[PDB]
Amino acid sequence: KEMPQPKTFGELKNLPLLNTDKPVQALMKIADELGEIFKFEAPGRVTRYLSSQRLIKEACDESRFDKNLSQALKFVRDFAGDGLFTSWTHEKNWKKAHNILLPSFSQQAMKGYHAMMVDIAVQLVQKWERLNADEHIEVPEDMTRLTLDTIGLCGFNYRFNSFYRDQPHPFITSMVRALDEAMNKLQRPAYDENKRQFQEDIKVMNDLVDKIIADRKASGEQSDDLLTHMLNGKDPETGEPLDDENIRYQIITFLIAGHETTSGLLSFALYFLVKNPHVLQKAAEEAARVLVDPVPSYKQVKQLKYVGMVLNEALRLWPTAPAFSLYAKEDTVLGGEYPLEKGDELMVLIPQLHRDKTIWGDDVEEFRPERFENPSAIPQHAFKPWGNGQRACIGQQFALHEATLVLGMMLKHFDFEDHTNYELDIKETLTLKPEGFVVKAKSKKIPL
Amino acid sequence: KEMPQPKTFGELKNLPLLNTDKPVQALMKIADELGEIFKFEAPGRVTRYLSSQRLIKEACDESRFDKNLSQALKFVRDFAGDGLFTSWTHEKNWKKAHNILLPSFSQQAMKGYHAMMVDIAVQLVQKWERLNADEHIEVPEDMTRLTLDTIGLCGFNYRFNSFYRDQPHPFITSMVRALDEAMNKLNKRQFQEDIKVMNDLVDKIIADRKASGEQSDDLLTHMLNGKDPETGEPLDDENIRYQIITFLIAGHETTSGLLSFALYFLVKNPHVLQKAAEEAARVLVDPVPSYKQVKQLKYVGMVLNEALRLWPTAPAFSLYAKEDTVLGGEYPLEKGDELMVLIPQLHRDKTIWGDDVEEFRPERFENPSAIPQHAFKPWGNGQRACIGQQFALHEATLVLGMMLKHFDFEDHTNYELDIKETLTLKPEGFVVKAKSKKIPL
């Protein structure tokens, strides 16, 4: 009846218990002590963290709870605007863009992005093929190079050329610095340079994207990217198209929502494979059996079943956008025991949900891809790395097609060594990633 | 590509090879002679018995094969209905009951059943503590008294009081007579009367519970309160009754058989008994075992897995091909063709376990992670695997642990193993003498 809550320390409330730069991991330990639900207060706010499948199934009821824009999302909204990720469900542009963009993110639509994803995936393989004997790979760095370039090419036919550079394209440098500033604002005279840089970074981003939109309208070119689709699509509901300003925000939004979530997933998957050589072997065996052509076809990517299972299991242990926020649309009672008032906030703690022992068995820390051999049997709302319902990840199919393709090619072309015996260090920002994860690859010398 | 087949008897096909009191043991000898797959036919039917991990791993692929209701399961369905064990995976009540009952069978849920399991376990140990010096124990008989009573208390808070009688409670008599009849079919008046004794009692307990409004720690409470997350519907009262009958039918003899075979292997291997008794003495430091103490009985758990490796008490399960497919690159099958997994023979696969497969060595389970996928399958497979796996193991670990703490055992008759076959396996006539260590209980 009364909601569990950690010890409060006078006016600091529960704040002294989260003195870390890894709040999700610390929250997971509080959940281990207090259970499926706890309230957490700090001087400014009140939130409630949910961890069990039984209560998350209720939180995922869209007639009762809707997506809440957390303080992180409101800060990201300063450059992501009313793009899909940082808009409220009730905003007109949320619904218009959702309806217009769904068909361009479907599984069927991946067939059209496939050649551009293969283009960047070949650049990564060649990079690693061309390393001399004494070098090594920086995993999350290379994966981020890949996902940024893939989203840029597939999103608006623009090449950041990240594998040609030490220093990223100026757009990228400004987007990542703006994102970093947005997240750093959470924990805050001498912030005047921060502010001016943020405004400069926003201007860099808007100018380039507005310029690419204007160039495309002026040429009439039609391409296999999302920009063509947004320029020509009309919302079936209102009959209206997106305006140019919103199309820019969607472009920025695809990059910010997709770049690190997807690179983190590839990095965590490669981490789990090198730490479990028998799993790596089974995945590599499938890659060799399936990828018989010089470059993978769309159909071959879809037959990489075990590779997909490895990605799902990496997502189960370390979902790379680890928490999403919801608000009660109306007064309601959660689980028959906890009364909530209209507007009360809930946080879904995804990694902890994914460790619910009543669903997955007592062995939740083990890396076992076989858990996903029959997806249809997993209980409803037990596995939620893509968020929920109409506010779920629109990029799901794109992220999985990209990651499946890339990991399959990695496993086909190289043998991997965890030459430093890397100790997992999970950095938390908007996303999760195995910071400093490094490997050596040994070419299998299989021609592209 | 050509599949072996044992002797045929004209129009009787292979049928007469199973007109024996021990058909699974006869099938194992045929597997010994014919290898990893053989065709077995009867008048209106065909099945293929599989024995190797290589072929059984493919049979366990749920995109290709699903559970088949064997003839034994269809006969058991006369009294178990559309409860979980005797339903097709595609029947609406299978998915509904599965979704609702899963969380009440997890390892976590054993925490809420532990006190009632302890109640019945203490009754068993107390019975043995009270035997005079001139007496012995009838092992499978006492293990069946314990598992029936535990499943009755944890399933629907009802006491069969099997340790208070020579002749079982009437429900038990009708259940075991009803099951024997269904197995002998592989009578009719009595069979209908035994079904009615079962339904009457179980329907009345359900009706009494709904009337009182009482909430217990049993499976009935969970079933009365649960709603299937997919449809939002609850199970109706008729299906709840079939689930209760089902828990008793599917869990009583398989679990008591496990406990009987484990004690058998321990008295036949004194060094293994002594290592298990030393763990039980170290871990079970209180007069009443706690849930956490049971979980620390790791070698006892290994002893139980090894007993299940040699004589898995539900020794065969049946599958059907979902679509046309080729098994092991050599054996083409058609949609609906049936496979039988011969578990005891799978568990004797020398390519997995080494050449010493007949030895009782609990240390094979030291590291569960090294066992190859689908090599060890006493609980069936996938979403149609035993839902009671955690309940059976918690009960057996708890009770074996207590047995080993409180008594020393003597195989006073130098018992010769005789495996009786019904729906399940057991060591018929296994008897022992237990001398108390006089440790508070």
Ligand code: HEM
């Ligand atoms: C494995 C990689 C990914 C993960 C784990 C992930 C996760 C998520 C999550 C959890 C949400 C919901 C956030 C919330 O409720 O506040 C979300 C929303 C979203 N994601 Fe992803 N994402 C991934 C990849 C991508 C990619 C590649 C794209 C674009 C190319 C993308 C674009 C979006 C968008 C636009 C939204 C907002 C959808 C809406 O509300 O209409 N994501 N993502």
Ligand code: HEM
């Ligand atoms: C050590 C003892 C046990 C063994 C060896 C065992 C074995 C099995 C096997 C092999 C199956 C699959 C049958 C098939 O594929 O046709 C099964 C299913 C089942 N068992 Fe167990 N069992 C044991 C104890 C229990 C207990 C104690 C319960 C109940 C409390 C139970 C309830 C069930 C149920 C309900 C099913 C059907 C589940 C479904 O298909 O949804 N079993 N068991």
